[PDB]
């Protein structure tokens, strides 16, 4: 294991959530992940154990406020009368799943969203579609790129369902089958991917269900630049997000030999999240580093 990221570098991540259906999640993100990371690296003592309760209060505040945008179908959108967003509903599931360890979260809100995604937004071929893009295109990270959207979005949604599985297993009968179908889609087109971003995000999705191996794993690994990062010509934030998904995949594979260089690269970026368009990069870099701290030998 490597040294943890100094808690002092993350004090700006304790934020007050505000705005509508999308903006509330943009504010909720940094706080949830900061607490998640500080919890795992146990830096509260050497930082302010009382600040945690405060952060928790802000998370509860974000959660309740998000419920005002839960539509009758269990889906989410910037406004209750706006067509529901596949990506946002999936992201809400993603964030709430990690926050299950911090505050009370209604399983039916989480699993209701999961059920809606499966029943309403998944094609018979396994693909997940977005029929009402979020207003804040800057909050979806690398998924903003139009190329390989079916793979990228399907991977993103699959990740959410996978992280929600433990919580929703007993109440969403179709969950297992949905995941299988999504995986099948990713598998049949993985070798054809051209973007390091899609390779990384889809790689993690496949790795979680033990399907990242053989030539797929070879593709995933060889896509990395200097064996320490997954990048494409574009915003650096997308590469930080991509490489974070890649780290999570490697951890899932237990490939601790390939891990050190990746973690070193991420730390060397000295990216501490926050700010316009940082949502995916902030959530992912810290989810990935926290997981690293938790698993890595």
């Amino acid at each position: 294991g490597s040294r943890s990221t100094d808690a002092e570098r993350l004090k700006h991540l304790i934020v007050t959530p505000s705005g509508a259906g999308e903006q509330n999640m943009i504010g909720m993100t940094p706080t949830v992940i900061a607490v998640h990371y500080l919890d795992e690296t146990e830096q509260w003592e050497k930082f302010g154990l009382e600040k945690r309760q405060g952060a928790l209060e802000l998370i509860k505040k974000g959660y309740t406020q998000q419920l005002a945008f839960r539509q009758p179908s269990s889906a989410f959108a910037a406004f209750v009368k706006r067509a529901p967003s596949t990506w946002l509903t999936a992201y809400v599931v993603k964030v709430f799943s990690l926050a299950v360890n911090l505050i009370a979260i209604d399983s039916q809100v989480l699993c209701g969203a999961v059920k809606w995604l499966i029943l309403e937004k998944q094609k018979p071929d396994g693909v997940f579609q977005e029929d009402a893009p979020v207003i804040h295109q800057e909050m979806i990270g690398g998924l903003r790129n139009n190329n390989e959207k079916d793979m990228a979005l399907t991977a993103f949604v699959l990740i959410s369902l996978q992280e929600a599985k433990d919580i929703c297993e007993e109440q969403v009968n179709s969950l297992p089958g949905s995941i299988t179908k999504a995986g099948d889609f990713l598998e049949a087109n993985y070798m054809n991917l051209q973007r390091s971003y899609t390779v990384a995000i889809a790689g993690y999705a496949l790795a979680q269900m033990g399907r990242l191996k053989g030539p797929l794993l070879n593709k995933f690994l060889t896509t990395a630049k200097d064996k320490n990062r997954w990048e494409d010509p574009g915003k650096q934030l997308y590469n930080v997000e991509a490489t974070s998904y890649a780290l999570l995949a490697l951890l899932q594979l237990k490939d601790f030999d390939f891990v050190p260089p990746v973690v070193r690269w991420l730390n060397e970026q000295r990216y501490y999240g926050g700010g316009y368009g940082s949502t995916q990069a902030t959530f992912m870099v810290f989810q990935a580093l926290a997981q690293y701290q938790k698993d890595a030998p």
Partner: protein, 65 residues
């Protein structure tokens, strides 16, 4: 009916961990307790509420590492 057993187990797990939390008052114990409770079936909505309230009260007292 293994589901009946699973659900009862989750409830047992949640109860133990919540009790453990009331004992130690640590972040680690808080997290396990909170997630455990989250896993308790709606079938036990009442004790689930009672268990959540117990978590909320331990936090009101303050954590210690």
């Amino acid at each position: 009916t293994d589901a009946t057993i699973k659900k009862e187990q989750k409830l047992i797990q949640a109860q133990n961990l919540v009790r453990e939390f009331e004992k130690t008052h640590t972040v680690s114990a808080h997290r396990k307790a909170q997630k455990a409770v989250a896993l308790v079936s709606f079938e036990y909505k009442v004790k689930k509420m009672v268990l959540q309230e117990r978590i909320d009260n331990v936090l009101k007292q303050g954590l210690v590492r």
